[PDB]
Amino acid sequence: SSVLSLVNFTVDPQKAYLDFVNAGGAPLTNCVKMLTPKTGTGIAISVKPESTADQETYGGASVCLYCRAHIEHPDVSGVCKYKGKFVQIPAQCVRDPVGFCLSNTPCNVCQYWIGYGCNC
Amino acid sequence: ASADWKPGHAMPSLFKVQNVNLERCELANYPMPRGVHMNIAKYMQLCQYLNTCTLAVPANMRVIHFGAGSDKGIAPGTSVLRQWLPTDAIIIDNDLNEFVSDADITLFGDCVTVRVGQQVDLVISDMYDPTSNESKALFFTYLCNLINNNLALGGSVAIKITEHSWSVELYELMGKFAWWTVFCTNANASSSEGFLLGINYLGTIKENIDGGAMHANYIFWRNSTPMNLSTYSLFDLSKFQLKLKGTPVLQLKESQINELVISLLSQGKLLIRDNDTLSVSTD
Ligand SMILES: C[S@@+](CC[C@H](N)C(=O)[O-])C[C@H]1O[C@@H](n2cnc3c(N)ncnc32)[C@H](O)[C@@H]1O
Ligand SMILES: [Zn+2]
Ligand SMILES: [Zn+2]
């Protein structure tokens, strides 16, 4: 509830979260990690869990900074890209799923995380 | 033990037919982690049990989830419902307190402020107010009225109760379903919690139930029944998702509901309700 206060006192919540955890701040906790058959396609964001053996799956709203801090979404459409969906995170990055999601982007034609599955 | 591999225990007719006084609930084990929130395992086990029930599963399935929030401000049960239900199911969730969820619609405030315009297909309640063991009112008055007015014929409910959080009238309403039980997850087997399940609503009394006596039977069952904490049932999730049944939705006058229709409703093969666009809003 410290980092959730912090991203409210700023114009650039993404940068503030990332700078906070990059300087030793505690990641946002209570991301909703699901139990899945680790047999999915491994795409970044999906209707249903799609985690591979190398990944974990989270409920989308719980790993979205803008949802968790109850602040305006930056998407031009106003519509969240995670909420109501599932988000696959690399299993090496489970310590800070919110940070991973702010730090990365899915490929626009293959839908896998760039640097974490996109073979384009 | 076999039962450790099941998602939990369902109250048997052996205890449903007893006739005993209400006694204190004394459980021997009153603790397994799984990395995830405990409610992840609890909801998935409730879903696994419902997978064995004759649930109606239509297109655009209408699901309301009450008590979906937590003191963490997140909704693990709603995310399990999202993982379990068909992609085109509509999920509406509600809690007294603010939270964020993967529901399609999220309503804050007392459930009595939730105005259901059209009948729904599935009601999940995890409502519980932490604050002699008499029948309780609270949100149970709202749920009872919902079953009588805003639930499709063929629809089902799963309503959290405990030793002290229960309702005479809600047990009696279980007699208006084709089948009912109380289901206790293995993940939370050391709590007096159970989910009162009504499967396939018929709108008419099929079983005459004395709700006070039946809660006494529920406690007698819990007091009589070793249950081990467990999550073994979540090891193979290959069949976890709710089967895509394409259950038909029909509009019928009560005059036309005959023996064939009742039989289809009772088998999980039909819903009767409006096929409108679902409007569910805060009053
Ligand atoms: C054990 S918690 C639910 C945990 C949640 N289901 C999950 O997925 O973690 C019980 C919830 O019931 C809610 N509640 C109690 N009475 C209510 C009411 N009258 N109307 C709406 N919600 C109510 C409380 O606010 C509390 O969040
Ligand atoms: Zn969001
Ligand atoms: Zn790509």
Q: Record the tokens describing residue B21, joined without a space.
A: 């006084």
Q: What gap in Å lies between CA B114 and CA B139, rounded to an integer?
A: 12
Strand partners, A56: A89
What is the resolution of the experimental data for this entry, in Å? 1.9
Fold type of domain B1-283: Rossmann fold (3.40.50)
Nearest CA-CA partner of B94 in B104, B82, B83? B104
Interface test with A, best of B42, B79, B97 (most A CBs within 10 A): B79
Kindly identify the ligand whose nearest atom is closest to the C-alpha of A62.
2
Contact B115, B283 (CB under 8 A): yes
Closest atom of ligand 1 to CA, residue B110: 20
Residue B13's CB is within 10 A of a number of other CB atoms, namely 8
| The pair of three-digit structure tokens given for residue B180, joined into one six-digit string | 């009912």
Number of domains in chain A: 1
Q: In chain B, where are the structural domains located?
A: 1-283
Question: Hey, what amino acid is at A38?
Answer: K
Residue among A63, A38, A35 at smallest CA distance from B36 = A35
Nearest ligand 1 atom to the CA of B97 is 25
In angstroms, rounded to a whole number, what is the distance separating the alpha carbons of residues B92 and B102? 9
Spatial distance between the Cα atoms of A112 and A59, rounded to a whole number of angstroms: 17
* A27 alpha-carbon distance from chain centroid: 12
Chain A residue nearest residue B85, CA to CA: A48
Radius of gyration of chain A (CA): 14
Chain A nearest-CA residue for B40: A34
Cα-Cα-Cα-Cα dihedral sign, residues B215, B220, B224, B228: positive
Task: Please count the residues of chain B.
Answer: 283
- Which residues span the domain enclosing A2? 1-120
Using CA of residue B178, residue B85, residue B79, residue B279, what is the dihedral sign?
Answer: negative
In 3D space, the residue among B185, B208, B210, B212 whose CA is nearest the CA of residue B197 turns out to be B185
For residue B194, the cross-strand partners are B161
Method: X-ray
